Design a protein around this ligand. Structure first.
Ligand SMILES: [Ca+2]
Ligand SMILES: [Ca+2]
Lengths: 63, 72
């Protein structure tokens, strides 16, 4: 529902930014892979080209 | 490559700040201490020396002690 999402996207934001810290603090990324193997792949899809299409699709609106 | 001063298998940032050893399916896994997960499962929080191959100077590394790859 768009109301529970609208009222609790702070914890939907903490849930992503926590896993961003695990993927790049280089000593423990493997604690993300063996405890959440799909969140690891989703951050792997970001790092392997997903960050380009979120970077290129902002300078096109910089006109 | 994560740094490892003492060549004992486990990295430097894990020895100083805490770590533990968990099994997931039937595979051992050496992970840093996460109190949200590892404390409910009844595990232990180990700390060792990042520059000694064996912290207590016996002939068994800190890797071999906590994992079970030791003389039984
Ligand atoms: Ca070490
Ligand atoms: Ca050591």
């Amino acid at each position: 529902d768009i109301n529970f999402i609208k009222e609790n996207l702070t914890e939907f934001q903490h849930a992503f930014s926590l896993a961003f810290s695990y993927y790049f603090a280089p000593d423990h990324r493997t604690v993300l892979e063996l405890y959440a193997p799909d969140m690891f792949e989703y951050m792997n899809k970001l790092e392997k080209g997903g960050f380009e299409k979120i970077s290129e699709s902002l300078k096109k609106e910089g006109v | 490559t994560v740094p490892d001063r003492d060549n004992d298998g486990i990295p430097d940032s894990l020895e100083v700040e805490g770590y533990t050893v968990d099994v997931k399916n039937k595979r051992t896994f050496l992970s840093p201490w996460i109190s949200n997960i590892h404390e409910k499962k009844g595990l232990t929080k180990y700390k060792s020396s990042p520059e000694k191959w064996s912290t207590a100077s016996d002939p068994y590394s800190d890797f071999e002690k906590v994992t079970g790859r030791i003389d039984k």
